[PDB]
Amino acid sequence: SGVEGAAFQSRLPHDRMTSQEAACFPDIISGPQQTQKVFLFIRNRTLQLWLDNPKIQLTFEATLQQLEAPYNSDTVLVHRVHSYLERHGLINFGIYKRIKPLPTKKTGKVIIIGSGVSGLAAARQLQSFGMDVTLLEARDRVGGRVATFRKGNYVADLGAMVVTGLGGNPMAVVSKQVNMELAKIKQKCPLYEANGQAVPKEKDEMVEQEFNRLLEATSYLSHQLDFNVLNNKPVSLGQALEVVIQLQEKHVKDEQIEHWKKIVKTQEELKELLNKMVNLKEKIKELHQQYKEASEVKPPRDITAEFLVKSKHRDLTALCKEYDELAETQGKLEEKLQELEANPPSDVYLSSRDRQILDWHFANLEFANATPLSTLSLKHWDQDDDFEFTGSHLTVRNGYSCVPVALAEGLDIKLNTAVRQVRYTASGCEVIAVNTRSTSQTFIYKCDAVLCTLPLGVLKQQPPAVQFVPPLPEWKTSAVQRMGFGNLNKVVLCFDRVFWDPSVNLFGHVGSTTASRGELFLFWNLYKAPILLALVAGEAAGIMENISDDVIVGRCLAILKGIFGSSAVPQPKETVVSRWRADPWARGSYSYVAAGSSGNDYDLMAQPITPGPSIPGAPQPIPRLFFAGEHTIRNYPATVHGALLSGLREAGRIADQFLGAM
Amino acid sequence: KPPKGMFLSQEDVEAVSANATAATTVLRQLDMELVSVKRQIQNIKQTNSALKEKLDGGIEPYRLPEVIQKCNARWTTEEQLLAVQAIRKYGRDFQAISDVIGNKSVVQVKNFFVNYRRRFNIDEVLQEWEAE
Amino acid sequence: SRTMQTARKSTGGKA
Ligand SMILES: Cc1cc2nc3c(=O)[nH]c(=O)nc-3n(C[C@H](O)[C@H](O)[C@H](O)COP(=O)(O)OP(=O)(O)OC[C@H]3O[C@@H](n4cnc5c(N)ncnc54)[C@H](O)[C@@H]3O)c2cc1C
Incomplete structure (x- = not known):
């Protein structure tokens, strides 16, 4: 976005002053907000100028000419900003054609x-x-x-x-x-x-x-x-990855245990049911024989013998009712068992x-x-x-x-x-x-x-x-x-x-x-x-x-x-x-x-x-x-x-x- | 806030890091727990297989035909005598007494308890039921 | 470091 992109390309925030800038411009950063925005624009513009043509040296004189008012108003501020950027190598770094030849006298x-x-x-x-x-x-x-x-x-x-x-x-x-x-x-x-x-x-x-x-x-x-x-x-990254991988392997095994523990609980509930149904079937079988013996006493018969037949009839249908209700419960747990055997959790983590x-x-x-x-x-x-x-x-x-x-x-x-x-x-x-x-x-x-x-x-x-x-x-x-x-x-x-x-x-x-x-x-x-x-x-x-x-x-x-x-x-x-x-x-x-x-x-x-x-x-x-x-x-x-x-x-x-x- | 499907509790990390071989110990304890539960499934699976063998055929030899009786208001002597015995066996289970007699509703059995109370000493008959 | 990666850049733990 013009000047804002120049800041980005120089690894600088366009909208605020860095620590390095605060040290060289303490007057500006501790001063009023308006003067900071002028500094920031001058900085961002000078960078843009350099970045648009980095094959030739950007001088202070060339920089001040391409600024407009009210930013080119203060000339020492532009000179301070330009000198900062040149010294820290944000402008005029690498290989460029120098406008002013190097001074013959070397210092240090x-x-x-x-x-x-x-x-x-x-x-x-x-x-x-x-x-x-x-x-x-x-x-x-x-x-x-x-x-x-x-x-x-x-x-x-x-x-x-x-x-x-x-x-x-x-x-x-x-x-x-x-x-x-x-x-x-x-x-x-x-x-x-x-x-x-x-x-x-x-x-x-x-x-x-x-x-x-x-x-x-x-x-x-x-x-x-x-x-x-x-x-x-x-702790190293390698250790940490090892620990993390181990905890995933743990969870896979914990997930299996909980799934197979759910099956035994269903199987034990089925076992308790089947024992109740076997004992009931035996009680029905005995009770059927008692009804059959009482029924084979041919008429005419007294009312106690008639009661015996009808008493046993009622008792037998009541027990046959219970066995039918338990056979429904058998069917519910058998399909509930088959769904868990059909959908297990993962065998391995990896x-x-x-x-x-x-x-x-x-x-x-x-x-x-x-x-x-x-x-x-x-x-x-x-x-x-x-x-x-x-x-x-x-x-x-x-x-x-x-x-x-x-x-x-x-x-x-x-x-x-x-x-x-x-x-x-x-x-x-x-x-x-x-x-x-x-x-x-x-x-x-x-x-x-x-x-x-x-x-x-x-x-x-x-x-x-x-x-x-x-x-x-x-x-x-x-x-x-x-x-x-x-x-x-x-x-x-x-x-x-x-x-x-x-x-x-x-x-x-x-x-x-x-x-x-x-x-x-x-x-x-x-x-x-x-x-x-x-x-x-x-x-x-x-x-x-x-x-x-x-x-x-x-x-x-x-x-x-x-x-x-x-x-x-x-x-x-x-x-x-x-x-x-x-x-x-x-x-x-x-x-x-x-x-x-x-x-x-x-x-x-x-x-x-x-x-x-x-x-x-x-x-x-x-x-x-x-x-x-x-x-x-x-x-x-x-x-x-x-x-x-x-x-x-x-x-x-x-x-x-x-x-x-x- | 861990990643979804990663499980990283404070407790799990300490258990796997507490010593050099704590990781492989924890995973072996769960491997042995897993083999332990699998054989317990096989045991009960084979136990229940044997119990299904004993229930083979259902209760189809021992089931009786459905009796479909028309309800009647007039009490015969036979029906009255069936009731006094049904009260002696079943007590106050009015549904049971109705099923025995065959042609009386649950309400008509309750009316029988009041209408023929003095004549069939029903208080004495219920006392004999409670004694057993 | 992570910034060196050209192929299959790791994303886990980066903002
Ligand atoms: C295999 C490999 C791949 C790389 N790939 C990339 C990449 O894709 N992208 C990237 O950005 N970076 C990459 N780098 C990193 C990059 O090469 C270095 O970070 C950078 O070049 C180092 O510059 P330097 O001036 O800090 O050190 P150096 O380039 O090592 O310069 C130091 C100089 O000191 C000299 N010297 C040593 N001892 C003495 C002595 N006693 N007296 C005098 N001189 C001495 C050395 O000869 C050397 O010339 C890679 C590095 C390697 C090894």
Whole structure:
């Protein structure tokens, strides 16, 4: 809706001021309501202007010209708003043609550890603000966990693969700046069982609904019943699902017991009736003989003998009446018995096949969080749900590496440079690194500040790859320990021809066991060339890194042969298997909210370190060691856009500190 | 507010989580309860099968034809004497006395109790019925 | 996390 949509696209509420804005505009937010709406319009309009053409720099002068009265009345307010948006990277981020060339004199010096998207994004901003910036990268390439495989015409992504909706995504801006061949991924995803045949539509929908009901139940368990500690240990999502599943199995058995208990009660009531009818039949039989003996006394007869015949006649019809009423009651209970024998409750909660298909949905959850469900925090695993972007998910058909390569343009990047030690003091920092090709070649970089974008996996290493001097404080290291760093791998299969449905972008494979539910569980058809990409998720991810490529490719072919037939599936021309946990510069795939952790730990990862004073009694020094990366952004963890946004955040915090605010 | 058809009471959760093997214990106790009830059904089913064998044929050999009598107001001596014996056997069950005599309504039997009270010593006859 | 899911997006427990 014009300006309101610009707010949405920048992850801002159009109709109110954020916490970050309140800090920079305390006069406005504590002031009258009318002035707030002017601020909000100026903000929303400036964002719209930037978003309509993000290929060129939006200057303050250009912004003020395109505003109308009474909003362009106050010029300092427009200047303050524009400067805020530029500093925090809401406008003039990414790759754009600069109107005013960069000032030759550079102010301050920053070392950025790592040239992934978080590092690259921060670097561009800091250079754009007029700082001297150098990136130290251990790999022989930029991009980090954005890692694209390229051989001939084959282009597949072993790391980041998918833009998860453009609605609110800063990668929407980057896609207008860089040629990413964005291609919508169609949602249709047929599951194929272990044998190779499709799951029937009736069963597929039944299990998926039950999976979501099970998930909903774990959330109910967490928030309503407060089932979050068990044996002084935090409850995982895996535990909770196990407990929920067990309670459904309990109910199935309780339901059977109550049904069969109703049958015995009916059968005992019938037994009591039949005994009464057998005793009555015997009383009728005896009474019939007495009537027959009395009746065979031929007339003429006295009145007592006549009475005897008629007395016994009356008594016999009275007993024959009772037996007829009891035979009606026999008929009522016999049909009431037959209805309960006809309509029993369920035999099982879930069969072997249902439970297998249910494990696929669990594996899909283990892919999403890059970890076994036994590691996920029950309460907080889905804490970032509210900030999900709207729209279709998209493939990057150019290969996602096109983004970091473009972001690296015009930046001082030292490749093959492994940081070994980070020293930070009140007077400055020095970063000590080596050449990865020959470890004896040592380098020393001196700077005013360090931005650490090392992956959480690297920060977790024991014994450490990177030493901090002085050591990081307990509040930082405990957060590092608490946070999860998952694993997820990809098998790329390049063929000479398409043997699969070209209109279906993805299809599942259901594993035989729970143990192997993540193993090659999901296939992707995303690229122009004939490429299939299979995922190894869950517990399989870690285990499958110790198995060779030939065996892994064999297991993929085995599965694909089962689905499309042996003659249809040729041997692939090129193959690649990722091993992200064994990668020493990643040590895993991406972060997750582990049991015992929360969203607050992401905020702790983001908090910069301030060293002690050099001389005792010297004034409180400024912060020196800053942190960015997917593991540092609470609302967008484990993503490219999260990394991107975290870099923009730290460039602003660093610029505010060393260039001064506004 | 759980999901529909999920059963998640506070008590159930504690029973299945209280120790490491409490889940499988609870489910085994109900499996044994289920087998216990099933054999109890088989027992009574086979008991009732034997009782139906003894009721085979119904009461069709022992049922008598329906007597269809026209009601009459005039008391014969025979009918009076049947009544005094019916009163001796059945007491005040007026419906029973009517069925025995065959051609007197329930109201006419009640009139008999008052009209012939002194003549058939009906107070003495009811005293003999109450003594048994 | 959950936001990563492209195929068969889980709905249970989301607002
Ligand atoms: C298999 C897989 C699939 C994924 N799919 C998606 C997806 O579909 N969508 C999505 O949004 N996100 C996805 N991601 C996540 C995304 O790749 C990351 O969140 C993001 O790229 C991380 O950026 P970063 O800059 O925080 O860290 P990184 O990209 O890892 O950058 C950090 C850099 O530090 C370097 N480094 C490490 N140690 C040292 C050292 N001692 N000295 C110097 N440099 C060092 C590394 O080499 C690296 O270049 C996926 C990740 C994986 C593993």
